[PDB]
């Protein structure tokens, strides 16, 4: 019964080191079950992230039409499995960026349920 909205917070929100992703991918349970190959963390307030659902409507990478792109670039961290990464000893490279985020939005209230892209 983890809601769709709560799953997005768990997977993608860090409103608050080159070791960041090793730390965070385990801390949010993205290394339980598998090494999730790619993950993005957004370092903005939840309110700023939820407000993107009110921003520029754009197609999601898979062709869905309920995605929204932020007007400003936002503070993010990319996490990406390393070559020596093999389950259950996952390992990640951290790359910081400032990019527009794209999310898919659902529900009432209308909030992000999928992190789609950064550009």
């Amino acid at each position: 019964k983890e809601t769709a909205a709560a799953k997005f917070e768990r997977q993608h929100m860090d409103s608050s080191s080159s070791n960041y992703c090793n730390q965070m991918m385990k801390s949010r349970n993205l290394t339980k079950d598998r090494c999730k190959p790619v993950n993005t963390f957004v370092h903005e307030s939840l309110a700023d992230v939820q407000a993107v659902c009110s921003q520029k409507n754009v197609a999601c990478k898979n062709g869905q039409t309920n995605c929204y792109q932020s007007y400003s670039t936002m503070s993010i961290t990319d996490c990406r499995e390393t070559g020596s990464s093999k389950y259950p000893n996952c390992a990640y490279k951290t790359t910081q960026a400032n990019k527009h985020i794209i999310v898919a939005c659902e529900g009432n209230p209308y909030v992000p349920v999928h992190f789609d892209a950064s550009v």
Partner: nanobody
């Protein structure tokens, strides 16, 4: 000004077998809504998508029960969407809602909703 509004017009009371048009024009949103559509909630029933269409006038979708009777259209380069409803049946009686910014006829994916317009088809 500051707020998005989906202004719904048209609808109302008609005899079974009659025709009505619903209209929806969005203001305050400064980009295309890729999909807009009409949903309804009839007495005793859950909300359901009725028709939807994309911003280029394609990707048209209808609920099975209204195909051939209802016609959705959009103004190109504007966020307006219309529903011509012919051959109306009593079970088309419902609150109709404009919806914008979602995906196809999936209601949970739409984030902007009109207040709802009654359509009442008598018998």
């Amino acid at each position: 000004g500051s707020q998005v509004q989906l202004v719904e017009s048209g609808g109302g009371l008609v005899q079974a077998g009659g025709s009505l048009r619903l209209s929806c024009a969005a203001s305050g949103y400064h980009h295309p809504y890729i999909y807009m559509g009409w949903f309804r909630q009839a007495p005793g029933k859950e909300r359901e998508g009725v028709a939807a269409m994309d911003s280029g006038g394609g990707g048209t979708l209808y609920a099975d029960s209204v195909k051939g009777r209802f016609t959705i259209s959009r103004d190109k380069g504007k966020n307006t969407v219309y529903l011509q409803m012919d051959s109306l049946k009593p079970e088309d009686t419902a609150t109709y809602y404009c919806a914008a910014g979602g995906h196809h006829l999936r209601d949970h994916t739409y984030g902007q909703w009109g207040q709802g317009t009654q359509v009442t088809v008598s018998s």
